[PDB]
Design a protein around this ligand. Structure first.
Ligand SMILES: O=C(NCc1ccc(F)cc1)c1cnn2c1OCCC2
Length: 149
């Protein structure tokens, strides 16, 4: 799988994270990110994908060692952590053919796992519009505790 890079943008209070909503298979909410191009450095892919999806240029704010990286089904996804971005920032994707909406979400209200269906004696997980974000939420909360407290 081709690695993906993007960002976890937080506001000044550290309460809220910026999520984007795509279409079709990407219909739920997730962190802005996308596939690395041949020869492209991880930091440049993160900035490009984030700029394409949100209109916000993170290049001056990325810190090389501040990221969360997960391997999901043998694909690497690395999100650089970008705090302190004002909640009144105007975010506008480049092409609304890929991004439906861009919103701030409260970190403490976001799920960090999907719910089962043990009420129905059925296996699996209930659908959740935050499916793509969920795997990063607990590591992000733990990372913010370690880095800030
Ligand atoms: O990434 C996702 N959503 C956020 C997004 C939307 C548009 C975009 F351009 C970038 C990020 C997403 C949701 N569901 N799936 C996703 O991607 C993997 C397959 C299933």
């Amino acid at each position: 799988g081709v690695p993906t890079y993007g960002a976890i943008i937080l506001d000044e209070t550290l309460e809220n994270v910026l999520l984007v909503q795509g279409y079709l298979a990407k219909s739920g909410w997730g962190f802005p990110k996308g596939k690395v191009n041949k020869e492209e450095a991880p930091h440049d892919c993160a900035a490009r994908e984030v700029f394409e999806e949100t209109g916000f240029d993170i290049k001056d704010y990325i810190c090389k060692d501040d990221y969360i990286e997960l391997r999901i089904n043998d694909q690497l996804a690395r999100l650089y952590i970008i705090p302190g971005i004002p909640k009144d920032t105007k975010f506008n994707p480049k092409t609304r053919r890929e991004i439906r909406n861009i919103e701030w979400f409260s970190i403490e209200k976001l799920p960090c796992h999907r719910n089962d269906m043990t009420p129905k004696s059925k296996l699996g997980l209930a659908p959740n519009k935050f499916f793509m974000a969920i795997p990063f939420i607990r590591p992000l909360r733990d990372w913010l505790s370690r880095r800030f407290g």
